[PDB]
Amino acid sequence: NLSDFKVATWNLQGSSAVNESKWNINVRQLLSGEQGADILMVQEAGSLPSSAVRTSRVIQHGGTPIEEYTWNLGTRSRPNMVYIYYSRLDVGANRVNLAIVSRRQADEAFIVHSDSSVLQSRPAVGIRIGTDVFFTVHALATGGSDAVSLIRNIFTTFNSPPERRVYSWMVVGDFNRAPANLEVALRQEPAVSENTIIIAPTEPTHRSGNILDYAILHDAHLPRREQARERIGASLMLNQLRSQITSDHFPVSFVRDR
Amino acid sequence: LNLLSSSGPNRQVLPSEPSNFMTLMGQNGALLTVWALAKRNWLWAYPNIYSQDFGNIRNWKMEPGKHREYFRFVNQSLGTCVEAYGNGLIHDICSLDKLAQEFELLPTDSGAVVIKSVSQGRCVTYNPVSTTFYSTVTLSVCDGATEPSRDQTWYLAPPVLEATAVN
Amino acid sequence: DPTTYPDVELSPPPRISLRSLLTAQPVKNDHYDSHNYLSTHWELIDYKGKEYEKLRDGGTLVQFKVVGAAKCFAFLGKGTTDCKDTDHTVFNLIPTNTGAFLIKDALLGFCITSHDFDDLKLEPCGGSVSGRTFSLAYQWGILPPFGPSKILIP
Ligand SMILES: [Br-]
Ligand SMILES: [Br-]
Ligand SMILES: [Br-]
Ligand SMILES: [Br-]
Ligand SMILES: [Br-]
Ligand SMILES: [Br-]
Ligand SMILES: [Br-]
Ligand SMILES: [Br-]
Ligand SMILES: [Br-]
Ligand SMILES: [Br-]
Ligand SMILES: [Br-]
Ligand SMILES: [Br-]
Ligand SMILES: [Br-]
Ligand SMILES: [Br-]
Ligand SMILES: [Br-]
Ligand SMILES: [Br-]
Ligand SMILES: [Br-]
Ligand SMILES: [Br-]
Ligand SMILES: [Br-]
Ligand SMILES: [Br-]
Ligand SMILES: [Br-]
Ligand SMILES: [Br-]
Ligand SMILES: [Br-]
Ligand SMILES: [Br-]
Ligand SMILES: [Br-]
Ligand SMILES: [Br-]
């Protein structure tokens, strides 16, 4: 079950000027302790931590870049390893990149595009661990207009392969639009709308006061129109912080209700 | 100690437990803390420099509460929980069924947070300026004030514990 | 810069207050009146030069910059000097298992410590600090900037 995992997301807002310190201050804190995330999605990742190491694994199975790295959150004598799946989309300035940090190795990766358009939208990048698939997204700044077709394409990818019919999937990231605004728009795709559930905080996730970071998921264990039975709640991940949050976005976690 | 024993790598000490705790620090550096150890006594806020002898009763483990978006605080040393009571906070036996032990933290635009009692609908308030060792901790209307005699902003900070470098 | 995704604005450096976990006092700059809150604020910027890699000890090189000025924290004058004087302004963040940070200078590999009120020095702390344990005198909190703030409203 997706609910077995502690999933989180954070838009790091990286840049040439500040990037490395953000991974070492905030990302490290989001992954540590008993309540640290098992899977963390990152947007605007910039460059990976300088100590991250590229593995020999090849997942590049298309035009969109995706690479696997390992990163040691501990010391050389007491390692505490995580994998990082990195999609360096921003070849222009190397800042608008996507990443997924996972304790467990991905069995497979997936890249799903939204509808063709003249806008430079970003694809959803994800990893499958067993029967659960996790995506990181960063929708367009102007109302995340690419979000509905992105969600629909992800849906058809798994729910239209034989083995994919039992997969649960979760799309997590910066949707750039209110949860209710996305919810209404998705109704234009009845099958998608009825097979998914938006899980989001009711507290701001950005310093503008807006709620822009959350998740949408499909739990294969639940029937159509019954996804609201999901026992996964969204919350600003404040229990992990021991420092200033170095971006204008607050990390958000998705954890099973206790 | 040996990093390599005769038959294999030997595990060095590097505690993960400290990662689970933190302190709630006011703008004046004062940390929300138990003072009188018996259950149901009032909580206060003392900076580390005036409370070294308090030990781990100054550290808390922040966990999600029973309800979505709320948190509860468990004392590192005593295992009791922060609880809204009357016009302040006390610590008492933990129970996921006690709404008074659940708090909503509201982020501010500086990255600090305001702590709101869900049962009372009031925020944790304190006086940054004090003629004594501590700030008095109360509950009052959530206006996000940041004055010398009344402030409601807190920082989610590292616990007061020996730290081990993980570089 | 020429990012591939122009819908995404470039974000400026994060604002912080740097506090000793022992004294809880924020390190101040002299660019603002001591009673003005901006005197407790710093912009955290990453140092990109490669001349201090030998003693980096796996930490992150940074500078603590004054808001609105090309000045950076340093053990010189009244607490700051020109940011271009990297030997005195580039420091090194060392993460810990608690979220606190140890801070070394990039040039000497010494540690910044504070054992008492208004005490701040850069002292030898041996070789690599990896896996070693330290008292609060060596610990620093990179925290929200001191001063007013507004509760975010959706
Ligand atoms: Br742990
Ligand atoms: Br592709
Ligand atoms: Br590695
Ligand atoms: Br080591
Ligand atoms: Br694995
Ligand atoms: Br796309
Ligand atoms: Br954006
Ligand atoms: Br909404
Ligand atoms: Br099943
Ligand atoms: Br429905
Ligand atoms: Br849980
Ligand atoms: Br041995
Ligand atoms: Br250990
Ligand atoms: Br401990
Ligand atoms: Br007592
Ligand atoms: Br008692
Ligand atoms: Br008392
Ligand atoms: Br939980
Ligand atoms: Br609830
Ligand atoms: Br203890
Ligand atoms: Br009473
Ligand atoms: Br001060
Ligand atoms: Br200047
Ligand atoms: Br400037
Ligand atoms: Br030395
Ligand atoms: Br306010």
From Swiss-Prot, chain B:
UniProt keyword Lipoprotein present: yes
Effect on the protein upon substituting Y46G: Abolishes toxicity towards intact cells
Localization per Swiss-Prot or TrEMBL: Cell outer membrane
Any single GO CC term annotated in Swiss-Prot or TrEMBL for this entry: cell outer membrane
Domain of life: Bacteria
Alphabetical UniProt keywords: Cell outer membrane, Lectin, Lipoprotein, Membrane, Palmitate, Signal, Toxin, Virulence
Region listing for Mediates binding to target cells, in residue ranges: 35-46
Membrane topology: Lipid-anchor
Domain Ricin B-type lectin: 67-156
A molecular-function term among this protein's GO annotations: toxin activity
Function, in words: CDTs are cytotoxins which induce host cell distension, growth arrest in G2/M phase, nucleus swelling, and chromatin fragmentation in HeLa cells. CdtA, along with CdtC, probably forms a heterodimeric subunit required for the delivery of CdtB.
Subunit structure: Heterotrimer of 3 subunits, CdtA, CdtB and CdtC.
Name of the molecule in the record: Cytolethal distending toxin subunit A
Organism, as annotated: Haemophilus ducreyi (strain 35000HP / ATCC 700724)
Gene: cdtA
Residues of the full protein shown: 57 to 223 of 223
